[PDB]
Structure formats: C-alpha cells, structure tokens
Motif scaffolding. Structure first.
Motif, PDB file in Angstrom:
ATOM      1  N   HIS A  71     -22.450  -9.162  18.816  1.00 39.50           N
ATOM      2  CA  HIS A  71     -23.631  -8.607  18.193  1.00 39.50           C
ATOM      3  C   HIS A  71     -23.329  -7.655  17.019  1.00 39.50           C
ATOM      4  N   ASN A  72     -22.058  -7.372  16.736  1.00 38.26           N
ATOM      5  CA  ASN A  72     -21.787  -6.375  15.719  1.00 38.26           C
ATOM      6  C   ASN A  72     -20.526  -6.762  14.944  1.00 38.26           C
ATOM      7  N   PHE A  73     -20.365  -6.189  13.762  1.00 41.02           N
ATOM      8  CA  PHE A  73     -19.116  -6.352  13.013  1.00 41.02           C
ATOM      9  C   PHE A  73     -18.905  -5.047  12.268  1.00 41.02           C
ATOM     10  N   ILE A  74     -17.684  -4.831  11.799  1.00 45.13           N
ATOM     11  CA  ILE A  74     -17.304  -3.551  11.232  1.00 45.13           C
ATOM     12  C   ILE A  74     -17.226  -3.660   9.711  1.00 45.13           C
ATOM     13  N   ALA A  75     -17.938  -2.766   9.034  1.00 45.37           N
ATOM     14  CA  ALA A  75     -17.929  -2.679   7.576  1.00 45.37           C
ATOM     15  C   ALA A  75     -16.645  -2.030   7.046  1.00 45.37           C
ATOM     16  N   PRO A  76     -16.376  -2.169   5.734  1.00 40.99           N
ATOM     17  CA  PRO A  76     -15.122  -1.615   5.197  1.00 40.99           C
ATOM     18  C   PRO A  76     -15.069  -0.082   5.304  1.00 40.99           C
ATOM     19  N   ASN A  77     -16.226   0.556   5.390  1.00 42.77           N
ATOM     20  CA  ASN A  77     -16.247   2.005   5.592  1.00 42.77           C
ATOM     21  C   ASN A  77     -16.262   2.381   7.086  1.00 42.77           C
ATOM     22  N   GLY A  78     -16.150   1.358   7.924  1.00 41.14           N
ATOM     23  CA  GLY A  78     -16.074   1.523   9.372  1.00 41.14           C
ATOM     24  C   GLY A  78     -17.398   1.526  10.112  1.00 41.14           C
ATOM     25  N   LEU A  79     -18.521   1.446   9.417  1.00 33.35           N
ATOM     26  CA  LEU A  79     -19.787   1.425  10.166  1.00 33.35           C
ATOM     27  C   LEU A  79     -19.871   0.227  11.104  1.00 33.35           C
ATOM     28  N   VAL A  80     -20.465   0.403  12.287  1.00 34.17           N
ATOM     29  CA  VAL A  80     -20.621  -0.697  13.214  1.00 34.17           C
ATOM     30  C   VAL A  80     -22.001  -1.259  12.964  1.00 34.17           C
ATOM     31  N   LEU A  81     -22.046  -2.437  12.353  1.00 30.02           N
ATOM     32  CA  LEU A  81     -23.302  -2.995  11.854  1.00 30.02           C
ATOM     33  C   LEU A  81     -23.731  -4.127  12.767  1.00 30.02           C
ATOM     34  N   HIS A  82     -25.035  -4.296  12.960  1.00 29.49           N
ATOM     35  CA  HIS A  82     -25.533  -5.397  13.761  1.00 29.49           C
ATOM     36  C   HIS A  82     -25.474  -6.670  12.923  1.00 29.49           C
ATOM     37  N   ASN A  83     -25.046  -7.784  13.514  1.00 31.01           N
ATOM     38  CA  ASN A  83     -24.778  -8.975  12.701  1.00 31.01           C
ATOM     39  C   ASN A  83     -25.999  -9.553  11.969  1.00 31.01           C
TER      40      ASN A  83
ATOM     41  N   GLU B 285     -37.116   2.961  12.540  1.00 32.22           N
ATOM     42  CA  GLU B 285     -37.209   4.111  13.435  1.00 32.22           C
ATOM     43  C   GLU B 285     -36.147   5.166  13.183  1.00 32.22           C
ATOM     44  N   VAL B 286     -35.226   4.894  12.262  1.00 27.04           N
ATOM     45  CA  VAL B 286     -34.173   5.849  11.969  1.00 27.04           C
ATOM     46  C   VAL B 286     -34.761   7.002  11.153  1.00 27.04           C
ATOM     47  N   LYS B 287     -34.296   8.223  11.391  1.00 26.51           N
ATOM     48  CA  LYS B 287     -34.855   9.407  10.700  1.00 26.51           C
ATOM     49  C   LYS B 287     -33.739  10.250  10.141  1.00 26.51           C
ATOM     50  N   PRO B 288     -34.034  11.048   9.105  1.00 25.96           N
ATOM     51  CA  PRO B 288     -33.035  11.992   8.625  1.00 25.96           C
ATOM     52  C   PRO B 288     -32.605  12.906   9.778  1.00 25.96           C
ATOM     53  N   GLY B 289     -31.307  13.152   9.905  1.00 24.39           N
ATOM     54  CA  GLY B 289     -30.820  13.973  11.009  1.00 24.39           C
ATOM     55  C   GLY B 289     -30.283  13.113  12.138  1.00 24.39           C
TER      56      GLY B 289
ATOM     57  N   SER C 160     -36.576  -4.125  10.643  1.00 24.81           N
ATOM     58  CA  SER C 160     -36.327  -4.308  12.073  1.00 24.81           C
ATOM     59  C   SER C 160     -34.821  -4.442  12.365  1.00 24.81           C
ATOM     60  N   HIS C 161     -34.028  -4.365  11.299  1.00 26.02           N
ATOM     61  CA  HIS C 161     -32.577  -4.532  11.431  1.00 26.02           C
ATOM     62  C   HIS C 161     -32.032  -3.448  12.383  1.00 26.02           C
ATOM     63  N   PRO C 162     -31.335  -3.856  13.461  1.00 31.08           N
ATOM     64  CA  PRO C 162     -30.905  -2.775  14.375  1.00 31.08           C
ATOM     65  C   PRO C 162     -29.750  -1.951  13.810  1.00 31.08           C
TER      66      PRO C 162
ATOM     67  N   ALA D 276     -31.432  -8.021   8.412  1.00 32.59           N
ATOM     68  CA  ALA D 276     -30.654  -8.565   7.296  1.00 32.59           C
ATOM     69  C   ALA D 276     -30.233  -7.459   6.284  1.00 32.59           C
ATOM     70  N   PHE D 277     -29.204  -7.741   5.483  1.00 26.64           N
ATOM     71  CA  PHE D 277     -28.586  -6.762   4.570  1.00 26.64           C
ATOM     72  C   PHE D 277     -28.901  -6.981   3.095  1.00 26.64           C
ATOM     73  N   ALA D 278     -29.004  -5.901   2.342  1.00 29.09           N
ATOM     74  CA  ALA D 278     -29.104  -6.039   0.887  1.00 29.09           C
ATOM     75  C   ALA D 278     -27.842  -6.688   0.269  1.00 29.09           C
TER      76      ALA D 278
END
Length: 172
Positions: free
Chosen positions: A160-172, A109-113, A92-94, A1-3
């Motif tokens: 399973h995904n939608f596109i944010a205004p900045n173009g990120l491919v986000l999991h629904n 599990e996401v890390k800097p880099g 757990s948000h993918p 889920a999203f902020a």
C-alpha cells in the motif's frame, strides 16, 4: 493520485532513478506504449521496483510496480511541510500521519500542525537497504490548488505504500 512533479525513486534493471512521476510516465510511454483506460491512460512498467516500508516493523524492501495511470483533474490539495517539500495530491489521497498513533488520513483532512511520516532519506542511498529510521515532518500549509492537469497513480501489486526520494511514506 499525485501531481506531475512529484519526485519518485525507483530502480530498473539494478540502477536507481530519481525523477518526476510525469517524466517516468513519459519514459515508459516511450518504451511500452500508452493504453486508454477509463477517463485516463495507463503505461506498463517492466522490471521497475520501488521501495516500500513495513510500517509496524520498519523493514524496507523492494517491490515491483506494474503500471502508472494518469487522468486529468481540476483541483488538488497541496500539503506544504515546514521543510519546504510539498505533497500535491487528490483530496481523498491517503497521507500517513501520526495523530493518536500512525494513521492514514485522506489529504482533505490533513491540517497545519499535523505531522507526516517518512524515513531518513539517507537509507535509499545505502548500498544495502534494510531498515528505515522514521522521521516526522510538520505540515505548514494545506491549500487547494488550481491544477487543471494530469495526476498520476502508481500500481504496486503487493503493498500500500512506497518511499519517496525525500523519504516520505506515500500511499501508492
């Protein structure tokens, strides 16, 4: 889920809107009513569409979004990109990353880099939106945030995904 402040790009009736997910929730709660569900609340959407990416092909198409659900959550993970954009999501948000190939990885599990996947955002503003060009963004910081507020999920039946205004491919 999203902020709550996560920006979303959607169309309704044929016109585009770009607003935070909380603003969009509040709009449709004004229009359609809120339904208590589980520990949360859901609002129905009518003829709202979002763009989604077929990640293998690169084809972008419109698809309907049916509901937005919200519930209270104490802690989120903030993934801050070198670009300055932040993705604030439940742990757990993918998140779509490129590591050894494209992979959905849970936020915790996401890390800097790491690099997060998106499309060039200009594609959403074209008269005809057909093919995306991928673009990658490097993750600068990943940290836990004291949130104590509503997080939002979009129910998108077909994808399973939608596109944010900045173009990120986000999991629904």
């Amino acid at each position: 889920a999203f902020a709550r402040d996560t920006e979303v790009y959607y169309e309704n009736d044929t016109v585009p809107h770009m607003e935070s997910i909380e603003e969009m929730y509040s709009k449709y709660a004004s229009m359609n009513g809120e339904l208590p569900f589980d520990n949360g609340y859901a609002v129905p959407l009518d003829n709202v569409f979002v763009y989604t990416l077929d990640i293998a092909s690169g084809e972008i198409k419109k698809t309907r979004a049916s509901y937005i659900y919200r519930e209270k959550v104490e802690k989120l993970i903030e993934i801050k990109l070198s670009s300055g954009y932040s993705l604030k999501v439940t742990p757990s948000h993918p998140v779509l990353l490129f590591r050894d190939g494209l992979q959905w990885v849970p936020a915790a599990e996401v890390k800097p880099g790491d690099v997060v996947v998106g499309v060039r955002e200009e594609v959403l503003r074209r008269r005809i939106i057909s093919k995306g060009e991928l673009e990658f963004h490097e993750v600068s910081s990943v940290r836990i945030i004291d949130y104590n507020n509503w997080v939002y999920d979009l129910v998108i039946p077909e994808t399973h995904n939608f596109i944010a205004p900045n173009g990120l491919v986000l999991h629904n």
